[PDB]
Amino acid sequence: TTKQICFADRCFNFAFGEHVLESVESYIPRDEFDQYIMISDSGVPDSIVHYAAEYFGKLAPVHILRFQGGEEYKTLSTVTNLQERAIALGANRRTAIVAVGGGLTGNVAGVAAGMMFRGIALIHVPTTFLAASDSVLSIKQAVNLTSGKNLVGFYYPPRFVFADTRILSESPPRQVKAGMCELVKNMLILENDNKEFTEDDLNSANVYSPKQLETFINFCISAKMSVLSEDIYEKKKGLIFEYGHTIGHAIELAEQGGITHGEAIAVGMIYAAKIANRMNLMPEHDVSAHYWLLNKIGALQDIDPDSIFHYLIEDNLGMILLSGVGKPAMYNQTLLTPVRKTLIKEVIREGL
Amino acid sequence: TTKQICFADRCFNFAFGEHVLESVESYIPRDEFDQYIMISDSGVPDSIVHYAAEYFGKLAPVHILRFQGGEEYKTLSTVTNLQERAIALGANRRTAIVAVGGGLTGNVAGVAAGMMFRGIALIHVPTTFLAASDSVLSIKQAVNLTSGKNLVGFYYPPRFVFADTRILSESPPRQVKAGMCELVKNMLILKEFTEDDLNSANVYSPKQLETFINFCISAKMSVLSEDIYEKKKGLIFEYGHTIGHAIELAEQGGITHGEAIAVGMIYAAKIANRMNLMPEHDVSAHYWLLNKIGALQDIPLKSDPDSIFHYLIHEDNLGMILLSGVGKPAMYNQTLLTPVRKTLIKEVIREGL
Ligand SMILES: O=S([O-])[O-]
Numbered sequence: 001t002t003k004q005i006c007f008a009d010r011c012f013n014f015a016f017g018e019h020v021l022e023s024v025e026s027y028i029p030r031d032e033f034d035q036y037i038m039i040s041d042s043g044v045p046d047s048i049v050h051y052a053a054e055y056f057g058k059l060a061p062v063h064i065l066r067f068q069g070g071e072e073y074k075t076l077s078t079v080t081n082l083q084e085r086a087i088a089l090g091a092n093r094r095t096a097i098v099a100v101g102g103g104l105t106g107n108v109a110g111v112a113a114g115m116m117f118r119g120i121a122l123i124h125v126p127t128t129f130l131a132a133s134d135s136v137l138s139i140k141q142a143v144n145l146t147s148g149k150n151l152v153g154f155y156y157p158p159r160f161v162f163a164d165t166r167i168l169s170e171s172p173p174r175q176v177k178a179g180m181c182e183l184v185k186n187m188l189i190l191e192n193d194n195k196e197f198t199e200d201d202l203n204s205a206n207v208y209s210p211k212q213l214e215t216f217i218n219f220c221i222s223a224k225m226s227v228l229s230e231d232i233y234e235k236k237k238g239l240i241f242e243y244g245h246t247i248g249h250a251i252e253l254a255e256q257g258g259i260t261h262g263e264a265i266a267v268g269m270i271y272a273a274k275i276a277n278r279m280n281l282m283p284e285h286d287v288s289a290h291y292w293l294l295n296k297i298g299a300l301q302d303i304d305p306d307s308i309f310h311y312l313i314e315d316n317l318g319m320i321l322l323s324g325v326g327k328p329a330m331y332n333q334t335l336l337t338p339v340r341k342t343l344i345k346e347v348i349r350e351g352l
Numbered sequence: 353t354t355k356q357i358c359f360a361d362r363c364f365n366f367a368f369g370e371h372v373l374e375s376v377e378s379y380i381p382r383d384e385f386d387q388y389i390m391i392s393d394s395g396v397p398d399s400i401v402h403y404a405a406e407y408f409g410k411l412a413p414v415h416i417l418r419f420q421g422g423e424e425y426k427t428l429s430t431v432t433n434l435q436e437r438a439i440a441l442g443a444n445r446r447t448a449i450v451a452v453g454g455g456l457t458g459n460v461a462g463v464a465a466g467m468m469f470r471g472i473a474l475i476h477v478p479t480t481f482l483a484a485s486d487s488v489l490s491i492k493q494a495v496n497l498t499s500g501k502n503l504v505g506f507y508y509p510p511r512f513v514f515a516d517t518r519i520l521s522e523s524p525p526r527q528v529k530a531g532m533c534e535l536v537k538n539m540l541i542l543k544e545f546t547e548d549d550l551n552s553a554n555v556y557s558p559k560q561l562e563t564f565i566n567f568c569i570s571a572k573m574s575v576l577s578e579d580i581y582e583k584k585k586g587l588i589f590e591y592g593h594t595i596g597h598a599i600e601l602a603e604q605g606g607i608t609h610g611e612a613i614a615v616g617m618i619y620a621a622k623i624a625n626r627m628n629l630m631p632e633h634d635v636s637a638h639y640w641l642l643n644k645i646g647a648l649q650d651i652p653l654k655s656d657p658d659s660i661f662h663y664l665i666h667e668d669n670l671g672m673i674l675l676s677g678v679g680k681p682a683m684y685n686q687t688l689l690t691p692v693r694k695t696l697i698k699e700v701i702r703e704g705l
């Protein structure tokens with residue numbers, strides 16, 4: 001399948017299906033770029049990197065640049081190093097950066113492509129379900145600073161995106177689950193009575209066929225772009241995709257790598273549902289709907305309050321809340337509702 | 353004086369006059385920012401930095417951050433270090449970055465502000481005539497790689513610009529001249545003053561500089577308001593820069609950017625005339641205007657033509673921005689880039705001036 005993705009006036013074609021790379025020659029004219037710099041962090045399977053290089057090499061010369069994976073290396077220093085090497089290889093304004101890997105690779109290659117000559121073509125080849133169904137449907141780019149995660153970056157759109165569903169269907173279950181957590185998030189914050197799948201199609205083992213993931217990806221494209229096509233910087237209505245992230249982010253940090261971003265956001269939504277309830281916004285029934293749906297994908301399986309609350313850090317803190325399933329709660333014509341710090345800490349204390 | 357400058361829908365106020373900072377409060381609202389992080393490379397006079405910190409401090413807490421000046425330090429590494437220090441001082445989205453200095457500081461602070469939290473406020477306080485009348489009238493930001501200058505960067509507009517003309521009128525004549533060369537360029541490619549107000553000593557009153565600044569704003573923005581990336585009609589501001597930049601590099605710092613561009617313009621005019629595109633009377637106009645600001649007087653040209661050729665090309669044609677006459681750009685294939693035989697370029701570089 002191929003969908004046109006537009007962020008304001010900047011669009012790109014997103015192809016996703018089995019062996020999509022075996023057809024890059026049908027989406028990209030051979031005269032478009034004169035070279036491809038393939039960037040992939042070490043945590044990415046070589047077989048995939050070499051597989052992708054073989055097909056892009058049919059359009060023009062390909063040069064593979066690998067770098068040390070890990071959140072500790074996602075820095076401007078790594079970007080600079082990749083840029084220096086890209087230039088030594090003869091990179092120019094006709095060269096295209098091909099990011100093959102997950103979210104970490106996407107961000108590093110994204111910042112690199114956005115700064116070279118003040119901006120060259122970025123091509124995403126997502127190897128994880130989270131990157132293919134969520135991060136690739138966002139033009140935010142960023143790397144870390146010694147003092148914080150993703151504190152430096154900017155907005156930069158890609159020119160092409162290719163997601164191989166065969167590769168995705170063979171990625172580990174837990175990694176697939178992290179993306180499914182964000183999909184359930186889309187189901188909770190948006191109203192949609194016309195999906196190509198039901199909750200009966202969700203499984204806790206998180207093992208799907210190529211076609212089943214294709215359907216999931218198609219659903220996320222429709223969900224996010226129905227909003228982000230206009231709110232390109234995700235500062236208005238786009239803030240809705242931040243559901244579960246306020247406390248989720250803090251929990252993710254507190255666990256120090258023990259849980260995925262998806263699992264953290266899942267617990268974050270539940271805590272957000274309870275909070276909305278304690279504040280007279282959301283009926284208890286909708287709270288249960290959060291547990292029910294998340295258990296269907298086994299989000300709460302592989303899962304200190306003071307620690308969590310510390311990372312989180314006036315008596316109030318803004319949160320994206322819902323009055324009910326598919327119904328975001330507004331405040332001053334904004335999606336940010338001020339919430340009592342003492343209430344947030346109490347809910348975190350009660351737990352799941 | 354205050355002028356509203358707009359690159360497409362991104363606008364900012366540019367105030368300039370004597371002690372414009374001493375009245376910053378009437379230019380910026382009290383609750384606009386909760387903190388000001390002053391960035392200034394080491395080559396900038398301490399008196400100016402502390403002077404600017406005193407007045408911005410009347411609006412909110414001010415922290416001064418310095419860094420090693422010099423082209424060697426205009427890198428992403430230097431930017432990263434400034435970003436870490438700003439964070440350690442509690443920088444946030446309500447914080448404003450104040451760049452006090454010339455082009456070097458402008459670019460370093462610019463890249464820093466543009467990336468923090470994916471973009472925070474950038475305020476320029478140009479300390480050189482060249483920065484105040486030309487570089488801050490461009491939203492290009494960039495730093496260098498070990499393999500090339502300005503290879504990494506992006507486009508990022510400021511929120512406010514303040515040019516204290518008292519400070520500018522006390523800056524060194526050779527510094528003033530470099531910006532004056534760009535002002536002459538503007539006069540040739542496209543005012544409240546005449547050629548009579550130009551002097552070769554390059555010493556001017558705050559008032560005269562205010563008039564020059566107004567002219568440059570009006571001239572550049574008449575084109576850049578729409579060509580924000582300077583990739584089309586905006587290429588006209590590269591006049592004299594094709595060979596000029598090669599010469600500047602070849603001289604390794606012996607000559608200022610302005611001086612290099614002045615020589616580059618003389619060469620472009622001769623080339624335009626030799627290609628039957630520009631009358632001799634127009635060529636002479638170039639020497640006349642440039643001699644009034646004493647741009648061709650000194651010029652310690654030491655490098656050899658081969659070195660200049662090398663930095664210039666590292667095919668029998670190179671593209672140049674040429675004129676058919678004073679104020680009349682030469683168009684080619686609906687572009688401002690006219691193909692020029694290497695033959696003519698090497699000849700003019702070899703003969704000098
Ligand atoms: O975590 S969101 O619900 O503010």
Ligand SMILES: O=S([O-])[O-]
Pocket residue numbers: 590591592593594595596616617620671672673674
């Ligand atoms: O240097 S400009 O005249 O091409």
Ligand SMILES: [Co+2]
Pocket residue numbers: 182245261265
């Ligand atoms: Co997320």
Ligand SMILES: [Co+2]
Pocket residue numbers: 393453454455456457458
């Ligand atoms: Co400077």
Ligand SMILES: [Co+2]
Pocket residue numbers: 534593609613
């Ligand atoms: Co210049």
Ligand SMILES: [Co+2]
Pocket residue numbers: 582586587588589590
């Ligand atoms: Co230009």
